[PDB]
Amino acid sequence: DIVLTQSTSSLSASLGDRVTITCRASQDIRNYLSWYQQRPDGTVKLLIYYTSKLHSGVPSRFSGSGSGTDYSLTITNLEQEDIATYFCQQGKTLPLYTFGGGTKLEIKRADAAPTVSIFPPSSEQLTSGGASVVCFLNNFYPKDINVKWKIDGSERQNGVLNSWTDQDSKDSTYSMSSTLTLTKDEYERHNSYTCEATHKTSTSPIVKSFNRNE
């Protein structure tokens, strides 16, 4: 029942820099701690076992250290292949293995503002009695963003689905889609439809809008 905590969920770094991820055991695991790299497509590789030993074929810029309860993985000179999620695992007693919750490793880049597009429901969806308003916010950085929906000057979160891509391997940007799901009647109740983004690239809200009555 040994608990592993990786306290950092996510961290940003630039290409070339030195990155350290920490793992804290709730008791002494006597160096039986391993590090795994999981890619967004789900591939898992072992990097380092028994605290500091490199798995065959693993680049020498990964290293590990620790003892007792405190362990860490360091990547010297970060490369874009190293963007990934990193997990620790204690293996002192089979089958009582435990894993830490993972630490996402993100690549840093210049701030980039989102290209926003808003989409009324198609008359085809309305015909069937549904009404989903969609907003896309593409190729932005950083990841932190606060999209909300305003309808006739009332903020709405109920029925709102937000979905984010992974960091893009070609421009290191993020994207997201926010969808407001309503019944046709709920949709018709109101007229003014606003997808409002709060992002550090703008002093004021980046907004996209339409009126139902057209």
Partner: peptide, 10 residues
């Protein structure tokens, strides 16, 4: 002791 998982499938 058996302590780590050195290869994983997809």
């Amino acid at each position: 002791r058996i302590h780590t998982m050195d290869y994983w499938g997809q």
